[PDB]
Amino acid sequence: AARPKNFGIGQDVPYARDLSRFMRWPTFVTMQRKKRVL
């Protein structure tokens, strides 16, 4: 039937949760964002 995984804190290995916002983008990618925000 079900298997329930709680991807809570410390209790199970999460799935491939999208990071895409805390990742280290290549220089120009961040630099063209820090430009339109500056």
Partner RNA sequence: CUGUAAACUGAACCAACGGGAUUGCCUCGUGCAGUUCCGGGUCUUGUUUCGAGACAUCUGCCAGAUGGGGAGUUUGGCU
Binding site for Mg ion (CB under 5 A): 28, 31
Report phi then psi at 15, rounded to 5.
Answer: -75, -170
- Asked whether 12 and 5 are in contact (CB, 8 A), the reply is yes
Least distance (Å) from RNA to the CB of residue 35?
Answer: 8
CA-atom Rg of the chain in angstroms: 17
32 binds, among Mg ion, RNA, none (CB under 5 to 8 A by kind): none
The CA distance from 33 to 28, in Å, is: 8
Verify binding: residue 26, RNA, rule CB under 7 A: no
Shortest Å distance, C-beta 8 to RNA:
2
Least distance (Å) from RNA to the CB of residue 24?
Answer: 7
